[PDB]
Design a protein around this ligand. Sequence first.
Ligand SMILES: [Mg+2]
Lengths: 237, 237, 237
Amino acid sequence: ESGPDALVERRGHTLIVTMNRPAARNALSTEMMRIMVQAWDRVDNDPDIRCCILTGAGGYFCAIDALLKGRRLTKPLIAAVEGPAIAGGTEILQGTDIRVAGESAKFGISEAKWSLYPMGGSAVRLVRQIPYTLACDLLLTGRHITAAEAKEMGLIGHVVPDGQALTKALELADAISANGPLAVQAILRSIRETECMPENEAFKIDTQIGIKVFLSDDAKEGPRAFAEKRAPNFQNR
Amino acid sequence: ESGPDALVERRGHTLIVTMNRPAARNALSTEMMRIMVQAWDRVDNDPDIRCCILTGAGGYFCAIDALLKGRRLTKPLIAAVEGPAIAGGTEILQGTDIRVAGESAKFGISEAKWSLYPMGGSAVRLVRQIPYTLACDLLLTGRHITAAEAKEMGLIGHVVPDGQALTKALELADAISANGPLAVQAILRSIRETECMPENEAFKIDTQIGIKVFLSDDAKEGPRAFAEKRAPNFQNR
Amino acid sequence: ESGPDALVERRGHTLIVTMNRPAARNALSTEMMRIMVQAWDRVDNDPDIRCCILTGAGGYFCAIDALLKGRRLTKPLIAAVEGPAIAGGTEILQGTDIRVAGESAKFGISEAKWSLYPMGGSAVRLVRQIPYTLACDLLLTGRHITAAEAKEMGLIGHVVPDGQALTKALELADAISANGPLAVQAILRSIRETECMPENEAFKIDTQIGIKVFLSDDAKEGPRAFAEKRAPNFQNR
Ligand SMILES: [Mg+2]
């Protein structure tokens, strides 16, 4: 209806991306997606950004690519879900790392009800992120579930009262942003680089990623801060 | 004891396969397995079948291949488990997609207690379908668990009062059968084809499978039905 | 402070390894790690050992390699966790198969708080062992969780009152040790050998491992014992 189809805001080291078509339940638009991709590039390219939050306006969530298919942000992405996260909203959710929902949020992948296909990658990701039979139930029946059920399935990690999803997400982003950005981002890189590698092969990649972190200046600041019984002040190097 | 070792029945678009040796707790027989494999071929070859249900007779579950090892049905398979699903019964369970159990059902892989090995593929599948340490507990101790515990582990998705497992399974099959068969079956195909592929490689397979669905006639009927605010009438093309 | 940095004890077929630096919250030392690796070799080389338990002394857990990175014991390993299992303790935990914790135990991977990296392999293993978003929460925020929360996540399987973790672990080891060691160890071998192999390829490895078990003398003793309605007496051959 009014304004840009996605808003981008900054809060400390956290970049907040708000899908903003509330009159259309934040249904994806091409302008919404262009704003999202450039925010994604901002997250990757700005060393001052340590965390990203994805949310929707107007009591809905959503009902280089869109749902981050073929691309994943190099910094942590927290979903703050209020209200419906159906179809596109649940596919996007699987491209986020940490997941908070309001109590009244709903999840579901309804594409097959209309003989459509989930193009956002749910048929690849969902069985890898929650127990197989629970994933199959969602993908094949297309039924909608509550936030409580989603947490029970392991699809999200936190359920908060309605309206507090963004608040809790910002608490989590504040904890991430206070951690060493080089460590946080190396962990993500390892998770992605080692996917579907048997662990003896994966450990070789993971060990080299880790040793690189230990060679940083920030890896000296962390221990110094702990010995000086004070909070660390990381510089992304 | 009496009758064929497996019964096959039709209910709408759903084919129902009933392991039928209740005097022997539906222990697998070669005649039971031959009847199962030809029912499986019926599911795959009959475009009118959109869903399959596997259950057992007589208050037991079970206590191209048997437990669908080396072969998986190309259409969704729902387990309706009443009573014991031990050893063979829990291996078969892992070849099904959606899983309903009566409250008094029991699960377990007891082979190692007798220095036997689970030949139905549990040592491959189980750690991939539920959390690693829960899978290890089952496989290495051989202990039996309740339906409630199985749902807690993510091994099954639904627990219903005793005797209602098939009823709930038929509700779920009715929802699947009302969905677009080309979409439902492409999702399964993607899940199977992309297994253990890193997601950037998997997404290429998954995208092509999906686009093929969108090119179908049924993918036009689904949206037309929604716009005409009516239920869709799919033709498997 | 006093005594060897790790104790090794035997209870029937079970070898018990106790990280023993309680004054330092059982923080890993090089002497602790040397004692652990030789105990590991004992587990692998002694046919009389059928199960191993890893625990810590003094109401802490821990706060060929250390956390079994690059190496895994060929026999089942049960963690008995009392008190803090932070950082090193939670990485080690992921190299164990069956997991018991006292009610007051705590888990967490805090490395990133100090811009350090989890060198024990958590960035590879954790997302494979529990739901993706729960793993990401732990690894990226570094926050600590209770034993109840860990069981909810699927990170451990059993929560017992404080002080009873080793007792429950010994119950579980007794059940494992009574099972056929050739079967138990083949299951582990299959799990490890088939990791990240698509199941149709994995099943070929898993079938050959299993058939080898069935050719053993113990695979005849198990059925004979059941027919003689008596407990089996396995000889690891
Ligand atoms: Mg997995």
